[PDB]
Design an enzyme around this catalytic site. Structure first.
Site, PDB file in Angstrom:
ATOM      1  N   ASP A 231       0.848  -1.192   0.000  1.00  0.00           N
ATOM      2  CA  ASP A 231       0.000   0.000   0.000  1.00  0.00           C
ATOM      3  C   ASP A 231       0.886   1.247   0.000  1.00  0.00           C
ATOM      4  O   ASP A 231       0.637   2.220  -0.712  1.00  0.00           O
ATOM      5  CB  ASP A 231      -0.900  -0.022   1.282  1.00  0.00           C
ATOM      6  CG  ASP A 231      -1.825   1.194   1.413  1.00  0.00           C
ATOM      7  OD1 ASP A 231      -1.349   2.316   1.684  1.00  0.00           O
ATOM      8  OD2 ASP A 231      -3.035   1.015   1.230  1.00  0.00           O
ATOM      9  N   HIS A 232       2.015   1.199   0.731  1.00  0.00           N
ATOM     10  CA  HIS A 232       2.908   2.354   0.804  1.00  0.00           C
ATOM     11  C   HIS A 232       3.743   2.613  -0.423  1.00  0.00           C
ATOM     12  O   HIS A 232       4.542   3.560  -0.432  1.00  0.00           O
ATOM     13  CB  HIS A 232       3.813   2.234   2.026  1.00  0.00           C
ATOM     14  CG  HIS A 232       3.020   2.261   3.321  1.00  0.00           C
ATOM     15  ND1 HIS A 232       3.505   2.305   4.544  1.00  0.00           N
ATOM     16  CD2 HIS A 232       1.656   2.229   3.465  1.00  0.00           C
ATOM     17  CE1 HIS A 232       2.521   2.294   5.410  1.00  0.00           C
ATOM     18  NE2 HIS A 232       1.413   2.248   4.734  1.00  0.00           N
ATOM     19  N   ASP A 233       3.624   1.718  -1.427  1.00  0.00           N
ATOM     20  CA  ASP A 233       4.323   1.846  -2.693  1.00  0.00           C
ATOM     21  C   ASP A 233       3.378   2.617  -3.667  1.00  0.00           C
ATOM     22  O   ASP A 233       3.814   3.233  -4.687  1.00  0.00           O
ATOM     23  CB  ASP A 233       4.577   0.487  -3.339  1.00  0.00           C
ATOM     24  CG  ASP A 233       5.598   0.468  -4.472  1.00  0.00           C
ATOM     25  OD1 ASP A 233       5.721   1.452  -5.197  1.00  0.00           O
ATOM     26  OD2 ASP A 233       6.232  -0.574  -4.649  1.00  0.00           O
TER      27      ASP A 233
HETATM   28  C1  HEM Z   1       0.816  -1.623  11.346  1.00  0.00           C
HETATM   29  C2  HEM Z   1      -0.560  -1.615  10.908  1.00  0.00           C
HETATM   30  C3  HEM Z   1      -1.192  -0.523  10.307  1.00  0.00           C
HETATM   31  C4  HEM Z   1      -1.356   0.729  10.834  1.00  0.00           C
HETATM   32  C5  HEM Z   1      -0.845   1.232  12.188  1.00  0.00           C
HETATM   33  C6  HEM Z   1      -2.126   1.478   9.873  1.00  0.00           C
HETATM   34  C7  HEM Z   1      -2.531   2.784  10.066  1.00  0.00           C
HETATM   35  C8  HEM Z   1      -3.150   3.598   9.150  1.00  0.00           C
HETATM   36  C9  HEM Z   1      -3.537   4.977   9.406  1.00  0.00           C
HETATM   37  C10 HEM Z   1      -3.367   5.748  10.702  1.00  0.00           C
HETATM   38  C11 HEM Z   1      -4.067   5.440   8.264  1.00  0.00           C
HETATM   39  C12 HEM Z   1      -4.679   6.816   8.044  1.00  0.00           C
HETATM   40  C13 HEM Z   1      -6.096   6.887   8.604  1.00  0.00           C
HETATM   41  C14 HEM Z   1      -6.795   8.161   8.189  1.00  0.00           C
HETATM   42  O1  HEM Z   1      -7.438   8.193   7.150  1.00  0.00           O
HETATM   43  O2  HEM Z   1      -6.666   9.156   8.890  1.00  0.00           O
HETATM   44  C15 HEM Z   1      -3.991   4.355   7.303  1.00  0.00           C
HETATM   45  C16 HEM Z   1      -4.341   4.469   5.982  1.00  0.00           C
HETATM   46  C17 HEM Z   1      -4.132   3.441   5.085  1.00  0.00           C
HETATM   47  N1  HEM Z   1      -3.906   2.117   5.446  1.00  0.00           N
HETATM   48 FE1  HEM Z   1      -3.421   1.313   7.157  1.00  0.00          FE
HETATM   49  N2  HEM Z   1      -2.436   0.711   8.756  1.00  0.00           N
HETATM   50  C18 HEM Z   1      -1.866  -0.519   9.025  1.00  0.00           C
HETATM   51  C19 HEM Z   1      -1.945  -1.615   8.193  1.00  0.00           C
HETATM   52  C20 HEM Z   1      -2.459  -1.563   6.917  1.00  0.00           C
HETATM   53  C21 HEM Z   1      -2.649  -2.718   6.060  1.00  0.00           C
HETATM   54  C22 HEM Z   1      -2.343  -4.185   6.434  1.00  0.00           C
HETATM   55  C23 HEM Z   1      -3.152  -2.218   4.866  1.00  0.00           C
HETATM   56  C24 HEM Z   1      -3.457  -2.898   3.661  1.00  0.00           C
HETATM   57  C25 HEM Z   1      -3.367  -4.336   3.412  1.00  0.00           C
HETATM   58  C26 HEM Z   1      -3.260  -0.792   5.063  1.00  0.00           C
HETATM   59  C27 HEM Z   1      -3.698   0.082   4.102  1.00  0.00           C
HETATM   60  C28 HEM Z   1      -3.880   1.442   4.233  1.00  0.00           C
HETATM   61  C29 HEM Z   1      -4.086   2.346   3.113  1.00  0.00           C
HETATM   62  C30 HEM Z   1      -4.201   1.962   1.635  1.00  0.00           C
HETATM   63  C31 HEM Z   1      -4.216   3.593   3.635  1.00  0.00           C
HETATM   64  C32 HEM Z   1      -4.348   4.904   2.857  1.00  0.00           C
HETATM   65  C33 HEM Z   1      -2.997   5.512   2.626  1.00  0.00           C
HETATM   66  C34 HEM Z   1      -2.981   6.863   1.940  1.00  0.00           C
HETATM   67  O3  HEM Z   1      -2.540   7.826   2.564  1.00  0.00           O
HETATM   68  O4  HEM Z   1      -3.388   7.010   0.793  1.00  0.00           O
HETATM   69  N3  HEM Z   1      -2.838  -0.411   6.308  1.00  0.00           N
HETATM   70  N4  HEM Z   1      -3.442   3.224   7.857  1.00  0.00           N
HETATM   71 CA   LIG Z   2       5.106   3.420  -6.280  1.00  0.00          CA
END
Ligand code: HEM
Ligand SMILES: [Ca+2]
Ligand SMILES: *[C@@H]1O[C@H](CO[C@@H]2O[C@@H](C)[C@@H](O)[C@@H](O)[C@@H]2O)[C@@H](O[C@@H]2O[C@H](CO)[C@@H](O[C@@H]3O[C@H](CO[C@H]4O[C@H](CO)[C@@H](O)[C@H](O)[C@@H]4O)[C@@H](O)[C@H](O[C@H]4O[C@H](CO)[C@@H](O)[C@H](O)[C@@H]4O)[C@@H]3O)[C@H](O)[C@H]2NC(C)=O)[C@H](O)[C@H]1NC(C)=O
Ligand SMILES: *[C@@H]1O[C@H](CO[C@@H]2O[C@@H](C)[C@@H](O)[C@@H](O)[C@@H]2O)[C@@H](O[C@@H]2O[C@H](CO)[C@@H](O[C@@H]3O[C@H](CO[C@H]4O[C@H](CO)[C@@H](O)[C@H](O)[C@@H]4O)[C@@H](O)[C@H](O[C@H]4O[C@H](CO)[C@@H](O)[C@H](O)[C@@H]4O)[C@@H]3O)[C@H](O)[C@H]2NC(C)=O)[C@H](O)[C@H]1NC(C)=O
Ligand code: HEM
Ligand SMILES: *[C@@H]1O[C@H](CO)[C@@H](O)[C@H](O)[C@H]1NC(C)=O
Ligand SMILES: *[C@@H]1O[C@H](CO)[C@@H](O)[C@H](O)[C@H]1NC(C)=O
Ligand SMILES: *[C@@H]1O[C@H](CO)[C@@H](O)[C@H](O)[C@H]1NC(C)=O
Ligand SMILES: *[C@@H]1O[C@H](CO)[C@@H](O)[C@H](O)[C@H]1NC(C)=O
Ligand SMILES: [Ca+2]
Ligand SMILES: [Cl-]
Ligand SMILES: [Cl-]
Lengths: 466, 104, 466, 104
Positions: free
Chosen positions: D94-96
């Site tokens: 997701d971070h990519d």
């Molecule tokens: C270590 C586990 C994980 C977190 C801790 C975590 C936390 C977040 C937070 C705080 C956000 C932002 C919330 C908001 O809208 O204010 C967030 C966004 C996204 N996540 Fe999270 N995440 C953890 C783990 C995952 C896993 C396993 C994911 C997918 C298989 C996953 C996805 C995402 C995505 C796509 C976003 C949006 C990112 C963006 O900024 O566009 N996360 N996560």
């Molecule tokens: Ca990328």
């Protein structure tokens, strides 16, 4: 940065450069004026530039009523509660109404005949006085609005000005939708594209996006290939009205004075019904009246409307020909031979390739008006797909489409299905013999003309609220 | 958007209740394909001299008009199955649908 | 306006309001902090607000290299011509490299253990220290880039730092694409959605738009239902490492100090391989460590990640559940009976209707994670449609997809097809018994484990430039 | 964009040569459906008291989480067929792909 007088390429100007040996402009330091369309997000380096549509995308007669509230109120007659649209207080066309004049800073119409001093007309859309035939169609609809408000006052004496205005406006918007999808679009698209892109209406779908796509602003300019080089005026005998029965278009752009001092709109509506449109042929695309003399009387130099169309697609960042053929599911020609086959004209194909280098770079209006026309249609398959997809969206995605349940009662729709632009001309002008429907096909006097009395009149009986 | 409305607003807003500015005036066009600009986001092909559009030089619009659109007026073919009203209704109808504003 | 210290709703804050009888926030005048995402066109009253993606949409290991030029240069070891990425100059993990520290003015990592004073790590993406397991993965790939640049220097002594950097980067980007599409996505979508949305690769298509759709930023958050409430750490014998073998996630967010002072990354990678993921069930959607205590150690109040996900979809203006089921061509439930049939759970359906009133308003993440899981997949039909459609576009619209003709030689592609994430762990850590492939399925020690020597290594012979 | 290139740019620019910002960083997301905002263009549903969404009041995100998402942690079902590495690759991946900035 006055793009009108200068050729310096500084924002917001994007002037058209002149080639060596240009047939008309011999000075390559000159240019044809061009202002880039206003961006939707000024200064953003983050957004991909996009443009603005100042009108409602819906087919709602917004060119009659306006698309913004100050203007809409100003077009109304507020001296009474009759729900009428304001009319010219200085002139009348044989006792019938003419449009109000506008109050422009630099009025182009005043420049077409300085001694006559007749300013531009004011209507719901700013281009009403662009050519007198357009003004005639705007005038006709203004008269129809007032005729309907009047008849409605008699049927329902308790209705106040707002209701009267709103109910007549609702009928005029439905008339424009019916004439457009029942009579005009079949003749544009031809029978198989009509079936394909505009299947029988089922119901309003709120998931259908009704916005005008940026490409449609360029693709629907295919109508420039239909323009004749004259404005024809005929008398009651459908004979050339003397003097000036045929006047060159370069002398009619913004000439509101011809509507007021040269006879009104009847000679002009007669000229439109009994004169054929120009056929778009692959070697006869657009006349020099618009390619060389566009707005000549009011600009420092005459413009080139085909060229303006191409420059405008680049300004709007539109993909070239092949990207649009691909969007429509049509084969994309990579070579001049393949382009020769798609166009069924290898000489045109080679000229295109000489100009553009690849079919991928042909500007959408140039590629689109170069395709062979569909059978019984006046557009080829790329244009048919773009215009057809656009009009299906404006119909399916409009909550007020006239056939949408609850918009009109079943009785009112049955009454409405009998309208026709031949009848509207009969009820608002002094013309007694008019074209037989389909009015867009009919063009030969007297073979395709009937007397106004054989046309069904709109029966407003079902609007009597009891 | 008012829960019951018998007439269209002047502006077109509230026609689609879920996304009420759709079809409304003074809104940006929708794009059916991503835009193609010389720099990728604002500059028009033909802005910078020497920049090619997908490996080919940009043709000047007035040159394309001169070489392909230009034709002798005396050879005009009248469309025997369409009146000039066909052309005029098209312009009137275009004016109900789009007007792209420019700076003054 | 600091959205973190106040509940005033004024731009840019959009605080979450507290319900009556909340299990934790008894003061209904308090709120869960929330800052609206930056707009793409700030201040416009013409544009429909849209958000920005700060990263490259492509699956190119941008989380390792950065998506902006100044940042990417700063992640490099510029003191020599070896094409290496910078490693931590004060700490090492049993002789192995660790990420450099960032220099954030307000650093959240420091706050998790004020006496340790270990700041947040610096990587291509800003969220590297969010949880130590994510830091472990980021470290692993840094080591793999350096391992690869070292081998390539041996095979090609004349390559300079830029070529070594680019070439190792190109193999790391391909490795992330192969593990994602070959091992990960089949287990997410399950076999029938994989066939439907990701049919066999044929070629790069330049008309395929590779941008991340706004809805994907919310829909891919389905992963929050897989989070276990603890960070697990095992020793070389895959036994709990003492002390602290299970630490609550509310104590590991931004805790860079645990990677540095509590054993490095091997116990964390081992814990990720031999512990099962949490199964998403309709009555067990997400744990309280993320629903009640998210970033509890560094915020004035613990956040709720499920609720932030739904509030984010409203901030982004995303359509509700039915609009997305219709986009995917899936039946749109209108009644609670129909929603119970879609969900195969009528109790869940009544609960959703009690909160939302209509299915048209269920927020996309909530409706999406409530659907029954596709067979051998971990998402239901709506999320399979959105994730499947998005990965299909990122693959066909990527000119550098690893199987695209000309990115890698035929011999290089054959060598890349042998990589596996178990092998990358064997090569960059002190772990010698690793999970059998597929590593995303394997989780039972010693049953699903193999010694590193049975795994094929990546043969770089085809990279020697003769 | 250079006519020939062998590696990806850092930014993702020029990966699509006809529309060079597609997929590049710090560009607006693409919309698969028109946005739904309380005023039609910027305000989020739930911003103004009393504004309904499709005829029904907006449900508080914290109330939906309390009611539907919450469950007793010791009842957690471990997935016998997936390892935690399946959850962790998902976040790294997701971070990519996306990071949506907020004001600081
Ligand atoms: C270590 C586990 C994980 C977190 C801790 C975590 C936390 C977040 C937070 C705080 C956000 C932002 C919330 C908001 O809208 O204010 C967030 C966004 C996204 N996540 Fe999270 N995440 C953890 C783990 C995952 C896993 C396993 C994911 C997918 C298989 C996953 C996805 C995402 C995505 C796509 C976003 C949006 C990112 C963006 O900024 O566009 N996360 N996560
Ligand atoms: Ca990328
Ligand atoms: C390269 O990829 C291109 C994009 O492909 C999409 O994404 C990839 C990942 C695949 O999943 C692929 O399956 C996707 O389509 C692809 O170009 C696309 O090709 C299709 C098929 O020709 C085009 O569809 C046609 O669209 C026109 C225009 O209407 C569309 O747009 C409007 C407005 O957005 C919508 O309202 C419409 O609903 C459509 O979405 C349609 O008129 C046309 O349908 C009509 O004709 C077909 C048969 O021709 C009939 O079956 C229908 O019933 C209609 O009567 C098609 O649906 C699509 O527009 C086009 N996209 C782009 C971006 O160009 C291309 O084919 C790929 N090339 C290769 C070699 O793979
Ligand atoms: C109300 O109108 C809705 C809009 O319909 C379009 O416009 C109107 C004017 C008509 O012309 C209509 O023909 C047009 O379709 C209409 O909703 C639409 O319904 C279709 C069919 O379900 C939806 O298509 C599905 O899309 C998904 C997602 O992929 C799409 O999006 C990505 C990104 O843009 C593209 O790259 C893709 O190429 C697609 O465009 C597809 O996965 C799905 O295909 C798969 O599943 C279908 C069955 O659905 C299989 O047959 C295929 O083989 C695939 O395996 C469909 O293509 C469309 O997204 C949806 N649009 C919207 C805006 O919701 C709605 O149904 C109308 N309702 C009624 C009752 O009239
Ligand atoms: C009396 C006949 C017509 C004109 C005179 C005329 C002139 C123009 C001009 C000057 C433009 C703008 C050029 C530019 O881009 O700089 C223009 C644009 C549009 N037309 Fe033209 N047109 C006449 C006639 C027609 C017919 C018959 C049309 C179609 C059936 C037609 C369409 C259009 C459209 C859609 C535009 C774009 C409008 C916009 O601003 O969005 N016109 N025309
Ligand atoms: C308003 O209506 C009356 C007739 O009802 C007419 O005499 C008057 O001129 C109209 N005013 C305008 C500005 O049209
Ligand atoms: C200008 O209008 C007058 C009437 O005011 C008319 O006689 C004259 O011929 C017009 N000028 C031109 C060039 O036609
Ligand atoms: C750069 O590389 C050398 C040799 O590999 C190493 O000693 C040095 O610490 C590295 N510098 C940084 C900042 O990572
Ligand atoms: C903080 O880090 C130290 C080492 O600096 C460690 O011993 C200590 O236990 C940590 N604090 C907490 C609360 O665990
Ligand atoms: Ca309109
Ligand atoms: Cl477009
Ligand atoms: Cl979206």
């Amino acid at each position: 940065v006055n793009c009108e007088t200068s050729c310096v390429q500084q924002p917001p100007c994007f002037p058209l450069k002149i080639p060596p040996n240009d047939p008309r402009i011999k000075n390559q330091a000159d240019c044809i004026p061009f202002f880039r369309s206003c961006p939707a997000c000024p200064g953003s380096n983050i957004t991909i530039r996009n443009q603005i549509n100042a009108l409602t995308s819906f087919v709602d007669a917004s060119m009659v009523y306006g698309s913004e509230e100050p203007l809409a109120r100003n077009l109304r007659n507020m001296s009474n509660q009759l729900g009428l649209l304001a009319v010219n207080q200085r002139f009348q066309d044989n006792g019938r109404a003419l449009l109000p004049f506008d109050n422009l800073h630099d009025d182009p119409c005043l420049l077409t005949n300085r001694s006559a001093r007749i300013p531009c007309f004011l209507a719901g859309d700013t281009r009403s006085s662009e050519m007198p035939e357009l003004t005639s169609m705007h005038t006709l609809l203004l008269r129809e609005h007032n005729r309907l408000a009047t008849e409605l006052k008699s049927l329902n004496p308790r209705w106040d000005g707002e209701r009267l205005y709103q109910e007549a406006r609702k009928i005029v918007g439905a008339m424009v939708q019916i004439i457009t999808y029942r009579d005009y679009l079949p003749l544009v698209l031809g029978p198989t594209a009509m079936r394909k892109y505009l299947p029988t209406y089922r119901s309003y779908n709120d998931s259908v996006d009704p916005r005008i796509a940026n490409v449609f602003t360029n693709a629907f300019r295919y109508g420039h290939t239909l323009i004749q080089p004259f404005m024809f005026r005929l008398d009651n005998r459908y004979q050339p009205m003397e003097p000036n029965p045929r006047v060159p278009l370069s002398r009619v752009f913004f000439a509101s004075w011809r509507v007021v001092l040269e006879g009104g709109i009847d000679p002009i509506l007669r000229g439109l019904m009994a004169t054929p449109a120009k056929l778009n042929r692959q070697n006869q695309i657009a006349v020099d009246e618009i390619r060389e003399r566009l707005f000549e009387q009011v600009m420092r130099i005459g413009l080139d409307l085909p060229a303006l169309n191409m420059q405008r697609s680049r300004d709007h960042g539109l993909p070239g020909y092949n990207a649009w053929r691909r969007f429509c599911g049509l084969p994309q020609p990579e070579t001049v031979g393949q382009l020769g086959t798609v166009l069924r004209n290898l000489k045109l194909a080679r000229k295109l390739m000489e100009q553009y280098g690849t079919p991928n770079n042909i500007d959408i209006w140039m590629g689109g008006v170069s395709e062979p026309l569909k059978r019984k249609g006046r557009v080829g398959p790329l244009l048919a797909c773009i215009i057809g997809t656009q009009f299906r969206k404006l119909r399916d995605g409009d909550r007020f489409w006239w056939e949408n349940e609850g918009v009109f009662s079943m009785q009112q729709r049955q009454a409405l299905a009998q309208i026709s632009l031949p009848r509207i001309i009969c009820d608002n002008t002094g013309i007694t013999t008019v074209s037989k429907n389909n009015i867009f096909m009919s063009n030969s006097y007297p073979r395709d003309f009937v007397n106004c009395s054989t046309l069904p009149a709109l029966n407003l009986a079902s609007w009597r609220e009891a | 958007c008012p829960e019951q409305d018998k007439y269209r607003t002047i502006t077109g807003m509230c026609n689609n209740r879920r996304s009420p500015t759709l079809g409304a005036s003074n809104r940006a066009f929708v794009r059916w394909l991503p835009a193609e600009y010389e720099d990728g986001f604002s500059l028009p092909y033909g802005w910078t001299p020497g920049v090619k559009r997908n490996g080919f030089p940009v043709a000047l619009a007035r040159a394309v008009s001169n070489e392909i659109v230009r034709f002798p007026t005396d050879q005009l073919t009248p469309d025997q199955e369409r009146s000039l009203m066909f052309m005029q209704w098209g312009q009137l109808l275009d004016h109900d649908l789009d007007f792209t504003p420019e700076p003054a």
